[PDB]
Structure formats: C-alpha cells, structure tokens
C-alpha cells in the first residue's frame, strides 16, 4: 500500500541500476538512488513501507552474474541497504508477500531452472526454504490472493508453460490449478479484486498482447481486453483498483509505454511513458520519498 509506482532495474543493452517512481496523481517521474548492483529479471515488493528488490541477473560486458541478493530501499532516507541473501541465485524470479513474509519463487541459475521456493522473515532478516513447486519455472508470474501464493506459467528449460500452481502455507504444499488458455513466459501477473491477471508474455513464437484472468471461485481463466502493445518481460502492479503495465519488449523495440487497465470499463489506456525503454523491471507501490530528483 502507498502512493508511487516504483520501477527498479531492468534491461536495455545491459542490465540497469535505475530506481524511478511514477506519481499517477500528477504524472511526474522521480529519479531515486540507483541500485548498488545493476539487475534485470528481478522482482520488487513492499513490506512495512520498505521496497525490496529480489534476485535477477546483472547482464554486463564485464560478466553476467545471477543474483541471490535481497536489497531494501527506504523512501524515508532514499537509501538502499543489503539484506540477507537467498539460498541461491534466481534470475527471472517471481515474488509474492503473504502476511509480511516475502516468498522467492523459481528462477534460473546458469542453465538450471529452479523449482525451489524460499521465504524471508524481515524481523529476523532470515531466509528459509519451503516446499518446492511441482514444476521447474523461470520467467514465472507470482501473485497472492487470500493468503495463498500462485505461480503462473514460465519456462521449464524445454517448454513455455500454461500451467499454474497454488501454495497453501499451513500445509507447506503446492497444488496444480486450471492451466491458462495461453502459454506464457515473462507475463505480468498480479491480483485485482478476486482475480489473478496474466498479461502479455511470450508463447515461444510471439510476444503477447492478450490478457486473461483466473477467478479463484470458478477456477476458470477468461480473456479480457488485450493491451495496446504486445509485450514480454513487462513490469506490473495494481494501484487504486487499476492494473499498470510498464515497459517490456515487443519483439522489435524496448518499450517505454505504461498502460492502465480499468476493470469497470474493460479498457487499456496509455497513461505515461518511462524516461527510457526497458524490459525485466521489478515494480511495486509504496509511500513517496523525501529527497529525490524530479525527471524533466
């Protein structure tokens, strides 16, 4: 919960250190403190008003390194601090938060595709491994609804997946759910009201503009209006009852486009542009900081 849409890292020619924040209320962008280490394919999440950047990879000319890092950004100080690292590097990770605890899901390390899952306890600054998923998944979308964690699509190393599964923390156990109608790796996955949305992604042939949503009560996936741009490795968040998708790759260009989905009207609209095109960002929402620089 909060007021700005923060976008951390990403990729354009090489992995990026940018931390920028968009204010839907006035259309303004702020540049904040860079990440300590560039990273794309990371996830962002917020707990207790702090922004966490999780996993990813630094794709650079001086060497490509998969990240096990968990770093914390304090909007009150405009500073990043390192937290305890995960058990393993996880590029193209998915992350969700249940009851103040951060779940790191899947992702890759070199040629290995993780089924493993681990949980962060901020109060103790400690990671612990939980039950692994039923399927190895990288480029996996993750969202939380009703204190259950969902892992949606991805890539197992051989095929892009339409499959999805759901984790019950009290049983430390994953269960398959209805697969999506479309195979999607690198989709934006997020929750709006009673529904898990999976927007865009790559089906192994094309970047996608289609968007489908899972109703947890009916156990079905239904397509809604498609986005204006096909995009994979997009950033996604929810703010005041609307979905926002940020950047991505459309098979031609690294997008700067930010689109807003209104569920009331079932329409996607262009709302703003990032200061530069990029894919594989981590995105989350929290309170405004105090001493940034406004982007002209």
């Amino acid at each position: 919960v909060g007021r700005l849409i923060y976008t951390a890292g990403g990729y354009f020619r090489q992995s990026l250190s940018y931390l920028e924040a968009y204010n839907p209320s006035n259309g303004s962008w702020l540049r904040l403190a860079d990440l300590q280490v560039p990273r794309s394919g990371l996830a962002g999440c917020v707990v207790g008003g702090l922004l966490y950047a999780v996993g990813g990879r630094n794709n650079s000319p001086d060497g490509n390194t998969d990240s096990s890092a968990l770093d914390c950004y304090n909007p009150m100080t405009n500073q990043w601090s390192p937290c305890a690292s995960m058990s393993v590097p996880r590029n193209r990770i998915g992350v969700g938060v249940i009851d103040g605890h951060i779940y790191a899901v899947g992702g890759s390390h070199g040629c290995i595709h993780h089924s493993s899952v681990e949980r962060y306890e901020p109060e103790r600054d400690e990671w612990h491994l939980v039950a692994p998923m039923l399927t190895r998944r990288i480029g996996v979308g993750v969202a939380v609804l009703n204190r259950l964690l969902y892992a949606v699509g991805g890539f197992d190393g051989t095929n892009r997946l339409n499959s999805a599964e759901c984790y019950y923390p009290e049983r430390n156990e994953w269960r398959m759910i209805t697969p999506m109608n479309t195979i999607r790796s690198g989709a934006g996955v997020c929750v709006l009201h009673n529904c898990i949305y999976a927007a865009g992604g790559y089906d192994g042939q094309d970047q996608l503009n289609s968007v489908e949503r899972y109703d947890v009560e009916t156990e079905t996936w239904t397509f809604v209006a498609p986005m204006r741009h096909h995009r994979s490795a997009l950033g996604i968040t929810v703010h005041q009852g609307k979905i926002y998708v940020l950047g991505g790759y459309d098979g031609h260009t690294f997008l700067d486009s930010v689109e807003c989905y209104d569920p009331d009207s079932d329409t996607w609209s262009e709302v703003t542009r990032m200061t530069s095109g990029r894919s594989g960002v981590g995105v989350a929402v929290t309170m405004e900081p105090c001493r940034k620089q406004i982007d002209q």
């Binding site: 193209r92 480029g139 890539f155 790559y202």
Partner: peptide, 6 residues
C-alpha cells in the same frame, strides 16, 4: 533471455 530481448 528472448522475452527480455536479451
């Protein structure tokens, strides 16, 4: 990888 356009 290719969804990032890497």
């Amino acid at each position: 990888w290719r969804q990032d356009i890497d």
